[PDB]
Amino acid sequence: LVHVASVEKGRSYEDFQKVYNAIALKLREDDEYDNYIGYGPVLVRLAWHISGTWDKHDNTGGSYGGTYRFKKEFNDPSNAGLQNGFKFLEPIHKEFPWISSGDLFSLGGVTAVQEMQGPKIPWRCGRVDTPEDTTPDNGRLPDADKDAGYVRTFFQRLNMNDREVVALMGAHALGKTHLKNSGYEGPGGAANNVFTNEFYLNLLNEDWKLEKNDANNEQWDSKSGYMMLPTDYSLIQDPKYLSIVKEYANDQDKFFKDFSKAFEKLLEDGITFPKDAPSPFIFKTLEEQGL
Numbered sequence: 001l002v003h004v005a006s007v008e009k010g011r012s013y014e015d016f017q018k019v020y021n022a023i024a025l026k027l028r029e030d031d032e033y034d035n036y037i038g039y040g041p042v043l044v045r046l047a048w049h050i051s052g053t054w055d056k057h058d059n060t061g062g063s064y065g066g067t068y069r070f071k072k073e074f075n076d077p078s079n080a081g082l083q084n085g086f087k088f089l090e091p092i093h094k095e096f097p098w099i100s101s102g103d104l105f106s107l108g109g110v111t112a113v114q115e116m117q118g119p120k121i122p123w124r125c126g127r128v129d130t131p132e133d134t135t136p137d138n139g140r141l142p143d144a145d146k147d148a149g150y151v152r153t154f155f156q157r158l159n160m161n162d163r164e165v166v167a168l169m170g171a172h173a174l175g176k177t178h179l180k181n182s183g184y185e186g187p188g189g190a191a192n193n194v195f196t197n198e199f200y201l202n203l204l205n206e207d208w209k210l211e212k213n214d215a216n217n218e219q220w221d222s223k224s225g226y227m228m229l230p231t232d233y234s235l236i237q238d239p240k241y242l243s244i245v246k247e248y249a250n251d252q253d254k255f256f257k258d259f260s261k262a263f264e265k266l267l268e269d270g271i272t273f274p275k276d277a278p279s280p281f282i283f284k285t286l287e288e289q290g291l
């Protein structure tokens, strides 16, 4: 399967910076969502789940085709709760009907991270919508109730290595688990709509307790009111993972730099970019624009 990036006709940096600003302006406006967390965390989760279907072996799945717009992927049990990120973006797609679905879902994730004061993420245009029959089947996204060997093995399919996996998981400092979506409940920290390295700090400094929640699932709970998933706590159980966790709890700039590279790579897996294709765009935030 080859998927070649095709820039939307005649579009350039300024067009996509207009779509960025539209998403970012609505993130500021619709602030009440999920008890004032706002839409940013569900939008970086949506960009991860449309990319996380990729399989390196046959180049199926991935962010290129925008296939989450089809019922099979929209109704995947693993995507429960992401309909709220879709409905947030649907106004903006009506306003810029020329951007492809893959591009709009991935730029929403980029915009949310930078607007929640994360690192800049280089983003590239050119994903092309593909037919309903290209939609990957349910079951390619990871279970939460498993251990470190499962996480390592699952992420080899998206060929991410240990460092990349640990840098990507730092995004679980954002938002929260919702019992009616996943059977898990609670936030992982106090700053859950500002991008920081707090996931790593909480993992190493809190007093975790294995408890059973109302959906009868086990999760790691702390006195402070935070929770960690079994696959999250996995990172301090494995010796290779645990020493990268310590590296990111001791250096927030290295965390930001490595997250930026692994999230771009995540979003680009499966796509062939021609050598005459434009460079990756670095978008300015509303704040850097005085907007």
Ligand code: HEM
Pocket: 041, 042, 044, 045, 048, 080, 081, 142, 143, 144, 145, 151, 168, 169, 171, 172, 174, 175, 176, 177, 178, 179, 181, 182, 183, 184, 229, 231, 263
């Ligand atoms: C083995 C890996 C992973 C598993 C099992 C997993 C699982 C989960 C689960 C069960 C939730 C709760 C969903 C809900 O109830 O609403 C969640 C939320 C979230 N995850 Fe993951 N995740 C994984 C990796 C990642 C990665 C790599 C990213 C992003 C780079 C990510 C970003 C998020 C975000 C931002 C949320 C919060 C959503 C919200 O607030 O609504 N996840 N994760």
